[PDB]
RNA sequence: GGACGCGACCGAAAUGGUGAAGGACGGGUCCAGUGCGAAACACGCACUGUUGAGUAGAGUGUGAGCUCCGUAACUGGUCGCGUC
């Protein structure tokens, strides 16, 4: 019944600003206090703000004082964060968390939001080049052969992969995507097959970046 | 000044059924205002415990909370398949809230040696004045294994990047990816590039490579 | 001896003025903590605390009591006088 979902999220260069959203349903924030916490690519969980009610008293911590504000609208049911001279350091997930009622579950943050991403650089956003990791042509490893696809240089992120439009999800690993030095991130999906018929059947990754408006469709073929 | 969770340990390996604990200790008093959650890769926090001890409606009995002064303990009685995630503790006795580093509990399993292959730069890259050259580490347990880089015999460093996946729903074995980049300069100046493996299943360190030319 | 009456002294319910006392005279208020109100702060309630708080009040009580100076019902006591 009880749900939360934030938006707003995107890419933002630094020392730009950007406001968030936490959309309430199957209950009102002006009964409970909100909260925003944020996480960083591979960290923790950081407290960012939160808002009490009644009284509508704000907390910040230090890394965001000054440059954050938590707000809310009960007209719209909505808690708002609004960033100001973003820094790349304040790039991550941002959850809206609702404090639960006291006498039920203490200062516990009972309900989470989905949460959205803010990446703060300076890159601009672009699209994947796809290249194919082509199966060897030699023998084995592990009894079966190996293909993929080399999605690089994409920003920011996410991106999605499939194989053969969903329809190959056995052996599919698709790693995590990694900031490269030059600040665009790149990552690789693979699956293995049987090296019988690598000939005969087809293999097709699907990449989507949607920030760029780039679908691509690359079939990986023995070179 | 600010209060620290210092969580412990940072990481974890058990088997289904085992007893686990986890422990958060403060640096400053909190009373009873400690909040656990547990977190699964890509999906938001779910509060377990709160007020140190009182177990949240809906959460299953096998998890439990107790606090001795300052330090924290979250126990697992009995773990179960989807008990497996990373959990955090929280303080929230006073702002700001404080949440200790997480700590990721993960299942044993017998060790599996990885499937190693190694994917040379395609055609339509290289015109693209870069090269990238992946080494592929597949369904192997546990995580740890150490991969090198061979061009000519010469040991990269610096110029590559590993990436692994969670462990998998099915066989809870890890699969990992170096990426050695390179310059299309530097690149067309060597012939054989080598990946070397180093992992506790393989009999013996195993090596997977190509030439450049053929 | 006794009764009644007058007066004085004393006592005295009551009352005006007065000036010392702080928590063992109280109430109010504030503060801290805890729990509660959909409620971490602010607001309110409840509980706890004076080794929490000014006897210059910081009170839309400095209220009660007491110190000290007066007025005083009287059903009071004593004494004198008049009368029976
Ligand atoms: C200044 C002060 N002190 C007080 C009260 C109090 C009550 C007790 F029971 C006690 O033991 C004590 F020492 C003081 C009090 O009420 N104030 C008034 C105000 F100005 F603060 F409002
Ligand atoms: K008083």
């Known amino acids: 019944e009880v749900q939360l979902v934030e938006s707003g999220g995107g890419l933002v260069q630094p020392g730009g600003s950007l406001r968030l959203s936490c959309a309430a349903s199957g209950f009102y924030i002006s009964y409970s206090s909100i909260h925003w916490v944020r996480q960083a690519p591979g960290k923790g969980l950081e407290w960012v703000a939160s808002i009490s009610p009644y009284s509508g008293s704000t907390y910040y911590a230090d890394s965001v004082k000054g440059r954050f504000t938590i707000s809310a609208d009960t007209s719209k049911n909505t808690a708002y964060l609004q960033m100001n001279s973003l820094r790349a350091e304040d790039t991550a997930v941002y959850y809206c968390?609702?404090?639960?009622?006291?006498?039920?579950?203490?200062?516990?943050?009972?309900?989470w939001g989905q949460g959205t991403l803010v990446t703060v650089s300076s890159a601009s956003t672009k699209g994947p080049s796809v290249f194919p990791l082509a199966p060897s042509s030699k023998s084995t490893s592990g009894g079966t052969a190996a293909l993929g696809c080399l999605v690089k240089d994409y920003f920011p992120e996410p991106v999605t992969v499939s194989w053969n439009s969903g329809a190959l999800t056995s052996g599919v690993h698709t790693f995590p995507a990694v900031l490269q030095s030059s600040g665009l991130y790149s990552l690789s999906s693979v699956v293995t097959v049987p090296s019988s018929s690598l000939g005969t059947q087809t293999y097709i990754c699907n990449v989507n970046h949607k920030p760029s408006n780039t679908k691509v469709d690359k079939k990986v073929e023995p070179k | 000044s600010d209060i620290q969770m210092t969580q412990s340990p940072s990481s974890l390996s058990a088997s289904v059924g085992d007893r686990v604990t986890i422990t958060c200790r403060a640096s400053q008093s909190v009373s009873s205002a400690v909040a656990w959650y547990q977190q699964k890769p890509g999906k938001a926090p779910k509060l377990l415990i709160y007020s140190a001890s009182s177990l949240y409606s809906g959460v299953p009995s096998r998890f439990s909370g107790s606090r001795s002064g300052t330090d924290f303990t979250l126990t697992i009685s009995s773990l179960q398949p989807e008990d497996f995630a990373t959990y955090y503790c929280?303080?929230?006795?006073?702002?700001?809230?404080?949440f200790g580093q997480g700590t990721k509990v993960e299942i044993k399993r017998t060790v599996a040696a990885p499937s190693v292959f190694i994917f040379p730069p395609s055609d339509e890259q290289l015109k693209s004045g870069t090269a990238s050259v992946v080494c592929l580490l597949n369904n192997f347990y546990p995580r740890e294994a150490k991969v090198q880089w061979k061009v000519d015999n010469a040991l990269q460093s610096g110029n590559s990047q590993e990436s692994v996946t969670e462990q998998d729903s099915k066989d809870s074995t890890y699969s990992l990816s170096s990426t050695l980049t390179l310059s299309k300069a530097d690149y067309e100046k060597h012939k054989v590039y080598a990946c070397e493996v180093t992992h506790q299943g393989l009999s013996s360190p195993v090596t997977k490579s190509f030439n450049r030319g053929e």
């Open positions: 968390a609702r404090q639960g009622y006291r006498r039920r579950s203490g200062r516990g943050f009972d309900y």
């Open positions: 929280q303080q929230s006795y006073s702002f700001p809230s404080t």
